[PDB]
Amino acid sequence: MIVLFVDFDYFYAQVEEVLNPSLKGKPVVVCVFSGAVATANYEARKFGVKAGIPIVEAKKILPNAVYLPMRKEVYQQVSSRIMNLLREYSEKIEIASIDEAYLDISDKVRDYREAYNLGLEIKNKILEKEKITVTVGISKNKVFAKIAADMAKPNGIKVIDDEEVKRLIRELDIADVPGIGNITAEKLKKLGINKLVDTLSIEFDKLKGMIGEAKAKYLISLARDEYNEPIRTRVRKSIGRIVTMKRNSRNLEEIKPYLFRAIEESYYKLDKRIPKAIHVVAVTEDLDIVSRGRTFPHGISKETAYSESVKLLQKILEEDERKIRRIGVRFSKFIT
């Protein structure tokens, strides 16, 4: 398998510059609504503005930058044309987000040298057609192709060959692995699980007890150099997990922890999808479902999800008399 990942560099800022040529050479800061920095262009970054910071903080660092509001509709139009460009290089495309796409090019190229040249041609094609630079990472699976891009960005191209995958499995710290945070890394550190390869020194049941089933399976398959997730776009109206309990119960306290395991797995699977709706799903002992949900004016943080989920499960415990056998959550109504 040869996977080619495409990361659009500072995408909203590049689009604003393509659309407004007189902004080129000036600091440009695209803002999410204060209000935070969505993206900072070359000059804005040079003078100390980073994505994610409050706009109030951005204006203290660089008072006279050009501060623009986000025009996501416009950025989406550009993005979709670029994804279209990319299908003509492979039909096995996974649109991961507005600025990120994976291509399986196993049938398009013979080796990593050929992969590289194709990455070069994709860069040239997008620059020619859309006036936008991209980073290309290439490796044996989606995860290492994404690590590749992160080693090369911006305006770069990097291959991680089979031998480099193996060195990286040994040398990468847990926090370096795409999708895995510091909280997760810190727990694992507490066990002397430091490197990606160290996840192979722990029993699976023990690993999943500390970090959850999904993260455990993910890290282990990567460390085993066995990760081979297909490249296709999916297509999620909902993201959720239902967990079978050891025993039928109506005890809110006995039930809570499985609900939380469900929420934790769901949130890992969300990625950076932001749900506006949540439903608690209870599978009763007779194998029916009772469910209760809420749709918030605001995206649901993982905290808001814990709180709310207990409230919804409490409602279920009140308006239904059966014992609960399995329990889970569903998140839906994703912005945008």
Side-chain angles (χ1 to χ4, degrees), residues 236-250:
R236 292 297 186 259
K237 285 190 96 67
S238 213
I239 279 130
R241 166 74 203 255
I242 305 281
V243 50
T244 313
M245 306 190 283
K246 339 286 256 76
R247 287 164 169 270
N248 295 344
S249 180
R250 282 184 59 75

Side-chain angles (χ1 to χ4, degrees), residues 61 73 94-95 149 209 219 286 297 326:
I61 302 156
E73 335 68 46
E94 166 159 5
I95 301 154
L219 287 170
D286 62 335
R326 326 194 183 108

Side-chain angles (χ1 to χ4, degrees), residues 36-47:
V37 179
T39 154
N41 83 334
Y42 175 70
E43 286 75 11
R45 294 196 307 280
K46 190 154 56 153
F47 286 94

Side-chain angles (χ1 to χ4, degrees), residues 213-236:
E213 205 181 332
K215 279 174 266 219
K217 280 189 158 193
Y218 175 64
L219 287 170
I220 292 160
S221 70
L222 277 171
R224 284 197 130 101
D225 197 5
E226 267 170 10
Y227 181 109
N228 73 157
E229 184 176 298
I231 287 75
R232 55 130 76 217
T233 293
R234 43 201 105 172
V235 173
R236 292 297 186 259

Side-chain angles (χ1 to χ4, degrees), residues 1-21:
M1 180 185 287
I2 296 161
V3 188
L4 181 142
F5 171 69
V6 185
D7 189 320
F8 311 164
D9 306 311
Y10 307 101
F11 184 53
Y12 301 166
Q14 285 199 270
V15 177
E16 289 300 346
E17 294 183 341
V18 171
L19 289 184
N20 311 85

Side-chain angles (χ1 to χ4, degrees), residues 172-287:
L172 256 20
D173 291 327
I174 299 298
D176 297 320
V177 173
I180 308 291
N182 269 157
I183 298 173
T184 302
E186 181 75 358
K187 297 197 195 181
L188 254 33
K189 265 182 198 174
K190 201 87 72 267
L191 288 194
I193 294 169
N194 292 308
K195 296 306 198 182
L196 215 206
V197 80
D198 296 337
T199 66
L200 306 180
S201 62
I202 180 172
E203 280 180 33
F204 173 71
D205 279 347
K206 185 144 135 32
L207 189 58
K208 73 150 197 146
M210 283 187 326
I211 69 161
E213 205 181 332
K215 279 174 266 219
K217 280 189 158 193
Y218 175 64
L219 287 170
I220 292 160
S221 70
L222 277 171
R224 284 197 130 101
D225 197 5
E226 267 170 10
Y227 181 109
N228 73 157
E229 184 176 298
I231 287 75
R232 55 130 76 217
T233 293
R234 43 201 105 172
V235 173
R236 292 297 186 259
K237 285 190 96 67
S238 213
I239 279 130
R241 166 74 203 255
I242 305 281
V243 50
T244 313
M245 306 190 283
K246 339 286 256 76
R247 287 164 169 270
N248 295 344
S249 180
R250 282 184 59 75
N251 201 282
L252 179 71
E253 280 337 315
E254 173 164 33
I255 293 160
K256 275 156 90 178
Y258 302 94
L259 184 58
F260 299 163
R261 263 171 55 203
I263 289 170
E264 293 294 331
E265 180 166 3
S266 301
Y267 270 78
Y268 170 67
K269 293 291 201 179
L270 280 173
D271 219 321
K272 225 233 78 194
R273 270 166 284 218
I274 298 108
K276 269 135 75 206
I278 173 193
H279 291 262
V280 169
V281 185
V283 178
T284 62
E285 63 194 330
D286 62 335
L287 302 173

Side-chain angles (χ1 to χ4, degrees), residues 13 16-17 19-28 41 43 66 68:
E16 289 300 346
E17 294 183 341
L19 289 184
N20 311 85
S22 57
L23 291 184
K24 286 176 294 159
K26 297 188 172 73
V28 172
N41 83 334
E43 286 75 11
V66 175
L68 300 176

